[PDB]
Amino acid sequence: GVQVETISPGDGRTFPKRGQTCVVHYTGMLEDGKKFDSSRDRNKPFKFMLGKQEVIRGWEEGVAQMSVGQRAKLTISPDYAYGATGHPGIIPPHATLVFDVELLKLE
Amino acid sequence: GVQVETISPGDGRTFPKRGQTCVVHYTGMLEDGKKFDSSRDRNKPFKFMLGKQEVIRGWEEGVAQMSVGQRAKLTISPDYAYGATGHPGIIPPHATLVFDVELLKLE
Numbered sequence: 322g323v324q325v326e327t328i329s330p331g332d333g334r335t336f337p338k339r340g341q342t343c344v345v346h347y348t349g350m351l352e353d354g355k356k357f358d359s360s361r362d363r364n365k366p367f368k369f370m371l372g373k374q375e376v377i378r379g380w381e382e383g384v385a386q387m388s389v390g391q392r393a394k395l396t397i398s399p400d401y402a403y404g405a406t407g408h409p410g411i412i413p414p415h416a417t418l419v420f421d422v423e424l425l426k427l428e
Numbered sequence: 429g430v431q432v433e434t435i436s437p438g439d440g441r442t443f444p445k446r447g448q449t450c451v452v453h454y455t456g457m458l459e460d461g462k463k464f465d466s467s468r469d470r471n472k473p474f475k476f477m478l479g480k481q482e483v484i485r486g487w488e489e490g491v492a493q494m495s496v497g498q499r500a501k502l503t504i505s506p507d508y509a510y511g512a513t514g515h516p517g518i519i520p521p522h523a524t525l526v527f528d529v530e531l532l533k534l535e
């Protein structure tokens with residue numbers, strides 16, 4: 322599944338609800354540190370609606386536990402991400418992913 | 429540190445404040461699935477006061493981020509549990525523990 326470890330606390334009260342849009346900042350890394358992508362590098366936050374199956378499973382359940390302002394490390398297993406096929410030219414097969422995510426705002 | 433993996437969601441609203449009694453149902457397991465204790469087996473809900481350093485650090489920080497009704501898996505690193513000194517027969521030296529915990533209510 323997805324393991325959630327808090328790095329820095331949020332407000333501890335405002336959590337993502339079904340139908341809301343989550344604006345977050347992230348950095349995707351492989352099990353061995355190799356950074357593969359980062360929204361921080363492009364200076365543009367990422368957005369997705371909760372409960373609409375837009376992002377990989379690890380993200381859907383992982384970010385739903387975070388509160389506004391919280392920075393957390395999500396460890397996601399292959400079955401909750403790209404599985405055995407992986408993703409062409411970027412994510413290897415049976416890859417365990419670790420994301421440094423920060424929930425910026427809900428709207 | 430401590431890693432939380434939510435099995436079943438909680439109300440997402442009621443969180444234990446430092447000074448309240450948490451009533452839980454846990455199952456203590458070792459890194460390799462081997463169970464060493466369970467409140468479930470003896471059907472006796474465990475209670476501890478959040479704040480007073482009664483329990484291991486992992487539980488203090490882990491349960492603090494759970495809401496009533498939530499059932500999660502706490503993966504505690506040695507430094508947040510019993511550390512270096514092992515206790516032959518039950519918990520080995522520098523062991524990572526896994527606790528299946530369900531938050532029943534607050535008192």
Ligand SMILES: CC[C@@H]1/C=C(\C)C[C@H](C)C[C@H](OC)[C@H]2O[C@@](O)(C(=O)C(=O)N3CCCC[C@H]3C(=O)O[C@H](/C(C)=C/[C@@H]3CC[C@@H](Oc4ccc5c(ccn5CC)c4)[C@H](OC)C3)[C@H](C)[C@@H](O)CC1=O)[C@H](C)C[C@@H]2OC
Nearest residue numbers: 347349357358359367375376377380402403404408411412
């Ligand atoms: C179109 C471009 C579109 C690009 C954008 C909006 C810009 C974004 C900022 C994404 C980034 O752009 C730099 C980049 O971000 C990553 O780096 C990443 O960090 C990551 O992990 N993210 C992104 C952040 C949220 C979590 C996760 C994700 O959710 O990403 C999603 C993802 C990659 C999911 C897979 C889609 C295909 C499924 O499989 C299928 C589905 C249908 C299929 C087949 C085969 C045939 N069919 C149909 C007949 C296979 C597979 O199923 C596990 C899941 C992203 C957000 C998609 O929703 C939307 C897109 O891809 C990805 C590694 C690659 C991705 O760029 C690409």
Ligand SMILES: CC[C@@H]1/C=C(\C)C[C@H](C)C[C@H](OC)[C@H]2O[C@@](O)(C(=O)C(=O)N3CCCC[C@H]3C(=O)O[C@H](/C(C)=C/[C@@H]3CC[C@@H](Oc4ccc5c(ccn5CC)c4)[C@H](OC)C3)[C@H](C)[C@@H](O)CC1=O)[C@H](C)C[C@@H]2OC
Nearest residue numbers: 454456464465466474476482483484487509510511518519
């Ligand atoms: C009095 C009996 C009292 C017993 C009960 C109320 C019955 C309970 C249902 C406990 C269970 O009884 C089946 C049993 O539960 C385990 O099975 C377990 O599942 C577990 O892990 N639990 C219990 C559930 C919460 C998490 C964790 C815990 O936190 O439990 C706490 C625990 C054991 C904390 C340690 C205390 C000692 C510290 O040691 C130190 C540290 C530093 C010290 C000294 C002395 C000097 N110094 C200075 C250097 C001692 C050590 O420090 C890391 C931390 C428990 C709740 C204590 O608060 C209270 C008790 O023990 C343990 C494997 C053994 C434990 O039986 C005991």
Ligand SMILES: CCCCCCCO[C@@H]1O[C@H](CO)[C@@H](O)[C@H](O)[C@H]1O
Nearest residue numbers: 509510511512513514515516518519
């Ligand atoms: C099976 C667990 C039994 C728990 C009760 C006994 C606790 O003993 C103490 O445990 C601490 C961490 O292990 C050590 O730092 C202490 O030096 C040691 O005296």
